[PDB]
Every structure is written in C-alpha cells, then in structure tokens.
Amino acid sequence: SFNWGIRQSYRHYILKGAAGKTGGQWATQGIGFSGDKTGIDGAFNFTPGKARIDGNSATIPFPGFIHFKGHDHGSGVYLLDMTFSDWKVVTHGSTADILVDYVSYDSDMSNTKDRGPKITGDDVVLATINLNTPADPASGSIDLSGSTTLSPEGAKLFIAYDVGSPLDPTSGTVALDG
Ligand code: HEM
C-alpha cells in the first residue's frame, strides 16, 4: 500500500473551508482513506498493480480515482469539480514522480454563477517525491516514503499554490508483482 494525503490544507479546504461550506465533499473508487480527514496523518490508500521495469526505473500503477467537489452557490452546478485518475509512480533513482490524469475547471474565485473552462491533463506529473531511500527495482520492493513538492503542471491545476510548494509526505513499501 502506497499512502499519500495530497495536501492536508487542501483536504481541509474541501471539507471545512470555503468549498466545504458550499457543498464540499469527496468520493473515491478503488482507493481508501485512513486517519483524520482534515488532519496531518490522513492519507488516501493506493493499491499497486503490476509494475513495469525499464532498467532502474519502475512504473507502478494504482487503479481508481479521487473525485473532489465543492462550491455549489445555488446555480445547480458545482463550480469546483476535480477528478484525479490513472495514478502511477515512476521512479528515477532517488526521486519519484507522481503521475495522474486530471479533469478540472479553472476559476477566478469570484464568479458564483458561471463555471469556468474545463482543463484536462493526461500523464501529467502532479508531484515529485524526494525519497528517503533510493528506489531499486532489482530488490523486488520499493519504499515510497519521503517528502513531496508540487509540480509546475499541478500548480496550474490547484491554482492557489506556488510551484515547488510542499505537499503531504508519502509512505508505504509496495511489491512489484501485481
Ligand atoms: C467561485 C468559486 C470559488 C471561490 C469563491 C473560492 C474561494 C476561496 C477562498 C475564500 C479560499 C480561502 C480558503 C482558505 O484559505 O481557508 C480559497 C482557497 C483555495 N481555493 Fe478556492 N474558490 C473557488 C473555487 C476554487 C476552484 C475551482 C479551485 C480549483 C483548483 C480552488 C482552489 C483553491 C485552493 C487550492 C485553495 C487553497 C486551500 C488551502 O490549502 O488552504 N478554488 N478559495
């Protein structure tokens, strides 16, 4: 199991912040959750698929999606509507990239009637793990614990955060068999 809470302050925003006061929620398929929902130890739980090895680089898939919603301001439409699927982690020695397919919508955070334009991204790097131990695919297992920073492409997706902002730390050792 690979564990990551994306960002604690983002999960607090969806459930208790300005998104949470206007219909904020999340839903998952294939992915669990453990810990405090708006807390530091809270993390989504990703189950690995069959890994793919290219030398010293493992690409580990994790099936399922995470769907965040919020900001119903009475128009019948969720103005925040953010789906994260096709989770994969590609290791690059001492770092690992977290890859997603997203569907989201842009916003100026002012218009409470009109949903902004759809944005998608396929095989987009969302974050990079500075790994505690370097990833070796020849050992049969990869420890994914480490600290994370937000990518330039996820920073377009999350809007409010800077490029290279810290995200939630990761944990868990997964096997590569399936
Ligand atoms: C009309 C719609 C929206 C309004 C009025 C709005 C307003 C706000 C407000 C008041 C905050 C401050 C909350 C806080 O700091 O605790 C906030 C933060 C934030 N908003 Fe929005 N927002 C809207 C839509 C969106 C959308 C579509 C996104 C999608 C990317 C988004 C992403 C964020 C993020 C990431 C934060 C930072 C949360 C954190 O970690 O503390 N917002 N917004």
Numbering used by the authors: 37 to 214
Quote the study that presented this structure, word for word.
C. diphtheriae secretes ChtA and HtaA hemophore proteins that bind ferric heme (hemin) via conserved region (CR) domains. Here, we demonstrate that their CR domains scavenge hemin after it is spontaneously released from Hb, and define the structural basis of hemin binding to ChtA and the N-terminal CR domain from HtaA by determining X-ray crystal structures of their protein-hemin complexes. The CR domains in ChtA and HtaA adopt related β-sandwich folds and coordinate hemin’s iron via conserved tyrosine residues that are located in helix α1 (Y129, Y49, or Y361, in ChtACR, HtaACR1, or HtaACR2, respectively). In summary, our results reveal that the C. diphtheriae ChtA and HtaA hemophores scavenge hemin after it is spontaneously released from Hb.
The crystal structure of the HtaACR1-hemin complex was determined at 1.88 Å resolution. It crystallized in the C2 space group with ten complexes in the asymmetric unit. In the final structure, complexes containing protein chains A to E are well defined by continuous electron density, while complexes containing chains F to J exhibit weaker and more discontinuous density. In each complex, the HtaACR1 domain adopts a canonical CR fold that somewhat resembles ChtACR, but notable differences occur in the positioning of the strands at the terminal end of the beta sandwich, with strands β4 and β10 being discontinuous in HtaACR1 (in HtaACR1 the strands are referred to as β4a and β4b, and β10a and β10b, respectively). For example, in HtaACR1 a “helper” histidine side chain located in the β6-β7 loop (His107) is positioned to hydrogen bond to the axial tyrosine ligand that coordinates the metal, whereas in ChtACR a second tyrosine residue (Tyr178 in ChtACR) fulfills this role. In addition, as compared to ChtACR, the β6-β7 loop in HtaACR1 loop that houses the helper residue lacks a disulfide bond. Protein-hemin contacts on the opposite face of the protoporphyrin ring also differ as the conformation of the β8-β9 loop in HtaACR1 is significantly longer than in ChtACR, and it harbors a methionine residue (Met145) that is positioned near hemin’s iron (the Sδ-Fe distance is ∼2.9 Å). Its close approach to the iron is made possible by differences in the α2-β11 loop, since unlike ChtACR which contains a phenylalanine in the α2-β11 loop that caps hemin access from the solvent (Phe271 in ChtACR), in HtaACR1 the phenylalanine residue is replaced with a smaller, less intrusive alanine side chain (Ala196). Thus, even though the structural data reveal that HtaACR1 presents a methionine side chain near the metal center, in solution no significant Sδ-Fe coordinating interactions occur.
